[PDB]
């Protein structure tokens with residue numbers, strides 16, 4: 263189902279990586295954030311919601327969604343309540359970049375454009391079909 | 394044509410807002426950045442390219458694309474070489490949020506979800522059709 267996303271943080275090199283997965287397609291978005299915080303999660307969701315039709319969000323750590331900032335974002339945006347494979351791609355391109363955040367975006371790109379249709383194509387097809 | 398984007402910075406409240414427009418649909422993405430820098434532009438393009446099939450980019454200030462970091466991102470990602478309407482929506486929601494960056498994302502959301510099909514639907518349709 264096309265409005266469902268998964269959202270979790272992983273850790274790498276002492277930093278936090280917020281990873282959203284469009285469950286039906288396997289498409290990902292990710293950002294490196296300073297701290298694993300309710301506020302950062304909220305802002306992330308705002309950005310995600312303006313880009314895709316986000317209806318429901320799941321997580322492996324329910325306590326992530328407990329902050330008032332997060333609930334307020336989900337309220338405003340109308341939302342209701344890979345990390346190993348990505349680390350793999352991060353590892354493969356890590357040395358081409360100085361900043362971890364740059365390596366993460368390189369990795370997100372590679373993940374979304376690979377065929378094994380790519381995740382990037384499937385999200386768009388699934389969502390266009392739903393219109 | 395579906396792989397064409399426009400990219401420019403505007404200024405608001407002493408900060409820089411990077412605005413990308415998918416020309417065929419009018420869909421936007423935007424971020425608040427510390428400084429109008431080649432490096433920030435590069436990183437922005439990396440993120441944009443992993444999310445959408447970006448083929449060519451235009452700007453109103455050609456000197457934006459002059460930094461080696463920018464050319465290197467366009468090289469890696471395979472890329473070749475609204476601000477008033479968005480400010481309008483920013484103005485309308487500005488008071489609901491503390492941080493400008495939050496108001497910008499609120500505004501991007503409102504811009505992409507409005508019908509006047511929304512920009513958000515058209516990008517996806519145009520791109521799915523192209524697959």
Ligand SMILES: Cc1sc(-c2ccccn2)c(C2=CCC(C)(C)CC2)c1[C@H](OC(C)(C)C)C(=O)O
Nearest residue numbers: 358359360361364432435436461462465466469
């Ligand atoms: C901090 C820097 S400098 C720099 C670069 C690369 C070539 C020429 C000049 N600058 C790069 C690049 C490395 C990877 C890419 C794909 C080639 C994009 C540009 C970076 C890159 O940081 C950015 C993306 C914030 C600029 C990095 O983390 O290494």
Ligand SMILES: Cc1sc(-c2ccccn2)c(C2=CCC(C)(C)CC2)c1[C@H](OC(C)(C)C)C(=O)O
Nearest residue numbers: 301304305330331334335338489490491492495
């Ligand atoms: C710095 C803060 S705190 C906060 C908030 C709002 C309600 C309850 C608790 N926190 C908010 C919110 C205001 C707008 C939204 C749509 C309701 C999302 C959450 C903000 C918001 O910053 C965030 C998005 C980085 C957290 C802001 O700039 O005001």
Ligand SMILES: [Mg+2]
Nearest residue numbers: 270271322323
């Ligand atoms: Mg988690």
Ligand SMILES: [Mg+2]
Nearest residue numbers: 300329330331
């Ligand atoms: Mg909170």
Ligand SMILES: [Mg+2]
Nearest residue numbers: 401402453454
């Ligand atoms: Mg400009």
Ligand SMILES: [Mg+2]
Nearest residue numbers: 431460461462
């Ligand atoms: Mg440079």
